[PDB]
Amino acid sequence: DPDTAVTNKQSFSTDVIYQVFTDRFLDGNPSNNPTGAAYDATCSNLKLYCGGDWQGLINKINDNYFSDLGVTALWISQPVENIFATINYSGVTNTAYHGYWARDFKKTNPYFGTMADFQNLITTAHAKGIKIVIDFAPNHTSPAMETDTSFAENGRLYDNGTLVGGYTNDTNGYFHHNGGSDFSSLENGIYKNTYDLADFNHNNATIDKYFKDAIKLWLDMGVDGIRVDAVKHMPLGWQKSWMSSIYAHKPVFTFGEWFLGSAASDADNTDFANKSGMSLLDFRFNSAVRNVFRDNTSNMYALDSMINSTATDYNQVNDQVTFIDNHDMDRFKTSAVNNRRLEQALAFTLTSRGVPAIYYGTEQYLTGNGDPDNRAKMPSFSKSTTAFNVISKLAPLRKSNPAIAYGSTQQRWINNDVYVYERKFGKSVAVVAVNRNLSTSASITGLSTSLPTGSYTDVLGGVLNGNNITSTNGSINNFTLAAGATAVWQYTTAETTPTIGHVGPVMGKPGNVVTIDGRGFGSTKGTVYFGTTAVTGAAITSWEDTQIKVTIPSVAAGNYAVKVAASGVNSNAYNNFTILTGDQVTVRFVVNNASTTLGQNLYLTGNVAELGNWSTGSTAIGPAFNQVIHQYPTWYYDVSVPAGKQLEFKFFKKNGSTITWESGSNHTFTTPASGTATVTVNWQ
């Protein structure tokens, strides 16, 4: 199967996501709508249910709405059964229409459909060539008041019906009872509740087990991806472990939400994208795009910085999910914001690097500021807007031109209002030109590109005042970029020499299968290389010009580059491939009376790659935590370690450039065969 087929659940660079709020989209079956109290046919009051079910989506896939639009994967609301309670916050009734108030992750939401309607969604969606990504929020259940079982459902969790436990009288400790998080530090936010939400304690083997089993269920149904909610509030140590159990079963493209406010680099968010085993939702990109196009609080140089910076901070910038707006922010379209600016932010987004995502109704210039006005009902299904055109003309390019899916980025011309970037992959090229100034045109002169000699037509057909150009060895003739224009020029040619574009997942135990998508491979099963180690024959399950499928060799856990050899020809390397020692389990390391000075931080390292291999660098584990679960001088950290394995390790303080190890002999610990465990030691 081609890299671009609908069966490629490990890569989305060729796709375009359509994030839909199931409820707010289309009531396709009124028999499932709730009774009275928490239902609104007029869908006037936005906090209550409105209808929108899975059938409506099926109705819309079938009647070709998404096909003429060009989106190739829909990202729906958390499918699990939510709480039926009606919560009343300061006078106003609130319901679980958003899907985030999980109750029992093992069943379907009756208001959205049944297991059978759910299969239908898959089968139908896959038939029309559309992947299904689903939201999943394992950080919590639902709102709950510790001292009041009457308040909502008291975060009660069920296992396919059987009541596991509530928030009050939570003896087994399936949740944290450390009060409300005030978001002052990263750890304050992982171990304390987020809003009034019952926070799960993933160090409880029962919970750890529950979730690994729950997600299995949804994967076995055929979902093509997962959008993990609030990844910023769960331990990376546990999520990594969770993530490897997923990649060991049925690997799908997983990306999580690490909510950021600005476009600036962020240490933690970057360690997460690189070390977790998943990619994030690109909030830095969203700020840039919004500042330049919507808000007008920055210029084009801010875009170029964000492009250059994010490529440097993320091991795979291509796995980040971009978007101009979403359900947790003001809708891009507003009274001041001109229709053309939205159309440009859309063009820019669709042609930029990473997996693009489009919040529903953007193609209809839908507005609404704040939650819940941003989550209004789909006002119409007209396939007539200009925005609809832009999406339907550019979106297919991800599937046709590899420079748009896999390509690198590079500025070719710029000033405060105009940006001209090139996207290239091997011989395939894509130039994009944008003039956000809506009143003054621009005289672009002296512009190089990698478009071979020829005459180029604006792929957009000029819907956005774009023009056609002429190359003479990349040298582009002088031309006037129209006011508010944006044009796209391209060139594409069947690649002959091998070249990798994307690998996924990019983590896993030897024995798993990873997908090496690319071009110019060949029809004859050649040789995959994890660094210096060769792979051939049976180990390679599939081999085509566009996509190889290989079995991770059984070699020393660690970072590795990935090369492919097409008949004596070595390709470019895909760096940062993490190979795990094998099945993972989360483990909480605790250390007593580890006094430290001002600015001095604790870290952890051991005798396996998962711990860094006696490293004190970035492969090390830390800094540790010393506030919520355990208090300073006692530190602690949740880490993903190999299962059933004798381990050695020491802690060390790293204030400035200097290191100081705990003395004596290494601490030892043999990990469980599955689950989680807490290990405590004293600072030697």
Ligand X SMILES: C[C@H]1O[C@H](O[C@H]2[C@H](O)[C@@H](O)[C@@H](O)O[C@@H]2CO)[C@H](O)[C@@H](O)[C@@H]1N[C@@H]1[C@H](O)[C@@H](O)[C@H](O[C@H]2O[C@H](CO)[C@@H](O[C@H]3O[C@H](C)[C@@H](N[C@@H]4[C@H](O)[C@@H](O)[C@H](O)[C@]5(CO)O[C@H]45)[C@H](O)[C@H]3O)[C@H](O)[C@H]2O)[C@]2(CO)O[C@H]12
- Residues engaged in binding Ca ion (CB under 5 A): 27, 32-33, 51, 53, 139, 190, 199, 233-234
Element (H, E) at 400: helix 397-400
User: Looking only at residues 52 through 71 of this chain, which bind ligand X when binding is defined by CB under 6 A?
Assistant: none
Cβ–Cβ < 8 Å for 234, 138: yes
User: From the CB of 559, what's the least distance to ligand X, in Å?
Assistant: 29
Site for ligand X contains 230 (CB under 6 A)? yes
Cβ–Cβ < 8 Å for 75, 135: yes
Site for ligand X contains 257 (CB under 6 A)? yes
Cβ–Cβ < 8 Å for 649, 605: yes
Cβ–Cβ < 8 Å for 49, 97: yes
- State yes or no: is 422 an active-site residue: no
Q: How many residues bind ligand X (CB under 6 A)?
A: 18
Site for ligand X contains 261 (CB under 6 A)? yes
Phi, psi at 646, each rounded to 5°? -65, 130
- Which range of residues in 52-60, 94-102, 346-354, 454-462 is near ligand X by CB under 6 A? 94-102
Of 135, 187, 199, 257, the active-site residue reads 257
Contact partner, 196, from Ca ion, ligand X, none, Cβ < 5-8 Å per class? ligand X
Contact partner, 257, from ligand X, Ca ion, none, Cβ < 5-8 Å per class? ligand X
- Which range of residues in 224-232, 387-395, 435-443, 508-516 is near ligand X by CB under 6 A? 224-232
Q: Classify residue 156 as left (phi > 0), alpha (psi -120 to 50) or beta.
A: beta
Q: Contact with ligand X (CB under 6 A): which of 41, 64, 88, 89?
A: 89
Contact partner, 259, from ligand X, Ca ion, none, Cβ < 5-8 Å per class? ligand X
Token representation of residue 287? 């700020």
d(CA 81, CA 102): 6
User: From the CB of 41, what's the least distance to Ca ion, in Å?
Assistant: 10
Shorter beta-carbon distance to ligand X: residue 316 or 374: 374
Contact partner, 199, from ligand X, Ca ion, none, Cβ < 5-8 Å per class? Ca ion
Contact partner, 219, from ligand X, Ca ion, none, Cβ < 5-8 Å per class? none
- State yes or no: is 148 an active-site residue: no
Of 229, 325, 495, 545, the active-site residue reads 229
Alpha carbon separation from 95 to 39, 100, 307 (Å, rounded): 9, 10, 39
Contact partner, 27, from Ca ion, ligand X, none, Cβ < 5-8 Å per class? Ca ion
Shorter beta-carbon distance to ligand X: residue 325 or 545: 325
Site for ligand X contains 381 (CB under 6 A)? no
Shorter beta-carbon distance to ligand X: residue 104 or 422: 104
- Which range of residues in 34-42, 253-261, 567-575, 634-642 is near ligand X by CB under 6 A? 253-261
Cβ–Cβ < 8 Å for 240, 275: yes
Contact partner, 232, from Ca ion, ligand X, none, Cβ < 5-8 Å per class? ligand X
Site for ligand X contains 266 (CB under 6 A)? no
Contact partner, 330, from Ca ion, ligand X, none, Cβ < 5-8 Å per class? none
Contact partner, 371, from Ca ion, ligand X, none, Cβ < 5-8 Å per class? ligand X
Shorter beta-carbon distance to ligand X: residue 63 or 328: 328
d(CA 78, CA 273): 22
Shorter beta-carbon distance to Ca ion: residue 12 or 54: 54
Helices (H), 78-180: 115-127
Q: Is omega for the bond preceding 372 within 30 degrees of 0, making it cis?
A: yes
Q: Contact with ligand X (CB under 6 A): which of 9, 24, 60, 98?
A: 98
Shorter beta-carbon distance to ligand X: residue 150 or 171: 150
User: From the CB of 374, what's the least distance to Ca ion, in Å?
Assistant: 21
Other CB atoms within 10 A of residue 270 CB: 18
Tell me which residue of 395, 66, 357 sits closest to 225, measured CA to CA: 357
- Which range of residues in 31-39, 117-125, 254-262, 394-402 is near ligand X by CB under 6 A? 254-262
Q: Is omega for the bond preceding 34 within 30 degrees of 0, making it cis?
A: no
Q: Contact with ligand X (CB under 6 A): which of 69, 137, 346, 629?
A: 137
d(CA 597, CA 644): 36
Contact residues for 346 (Cβ-Cβ < 8 A; gap 6+)? 324, 358, 362, 387, 390, 391, 394
Shorter beta-carbon distance to ligand X: residue 332 or 489: 332
User: From the CB of 360, what's the least distance to ligand X, in Å?
Assistant: 14
What does the DSSP assignment read for 32-63? GSPPGGGB-SS--STTSB----HHHHHHHHHT
469-472 β-sheet, strand order: 454-456, 469-472, 475-476
Q: Contact with ligand X (CB under 6 A): which of 328, 478, 523, 670?
A: 328
- Which range of residues in 53-61, 257-265, 391-399, 571-579 is near ligand X by CB under 6 A? 257-265
What does the DSSP assignment read for 191-204? HSBBTTEEEB-TTS
Cβ–Cβ < 8 Å for 496, 522: no
Site for ligand X contains 327 (CB under 6 A)? yes
Q: Contact with ligand X (CB under 6 A): which of 195, 461, 668, 678?
A: 195
CA–centroid distance for 330 within its chain: 20
CA R_g for the chain: 26
Contact partner, 381, from ligand X, Ca ion, none, Cβ < 5-8 Å per class? none
Shorter beta-carbon distance to ligand X: residue 262 or 448: 262
Site for ligand X contains 371 (CB under 6 A)? yes
Helices (H), 276-338: 283-289, 300-313
Shorter beta-carbon distance to ligand X: residue 136 or 636: 136
Contact partner, 476, from Ca ion, ligand X, none, Cβ < 5-8 Å per class? none
Other CB atoms within 10 A of residue 646 CB: 11
Half-sphere exposure of 317 (CA within 13 A, CB side): 17
User: From the CB of 198, what's the least distance to ligand X, in Å?
Assistant: 11
Please enumerate, as own/partner, the contacts of 301-307 that have beta carbons within 8 Å and a separation of 24 or more. 301/414, 301/416, 302/263, 303/348, 303/419, 304/411, 304/414, 304/419, 305/263, 306/263, 307/352, 307/353, 307/409, 307/411, 307/421
Cβ–Cβ < 8 Å for 405, 546: no
Site for ligand X contains 661 (CB under 6 A)? no
Site for ligand X contains 331 (CB under 6 A)? no
Residue in this structure with the two tokens 């046709």, named with its chain if needed: 400
Shorter beta-carbon distance to Ca ion: residue 139 or 287: 139
d(CA 606, CA 616): 10
User: From the CB of 646, what's the least distance to ligand X, in Å?
Assistant: 38
Q: Contact with ligand X (CB under 6 A): which of 39, 259, 301, 614?
A: 259
Shorter beta-carbon distance to ligand X: residue 152 or 608: 152
Catalytic residues: 229, 257
Contacting positions for ligand X (CB under 6 A): 89, 94, 98, 100, 137, 143, 183, 195-196, 229-230, 232, 257, 259, 261, 327-328, 371
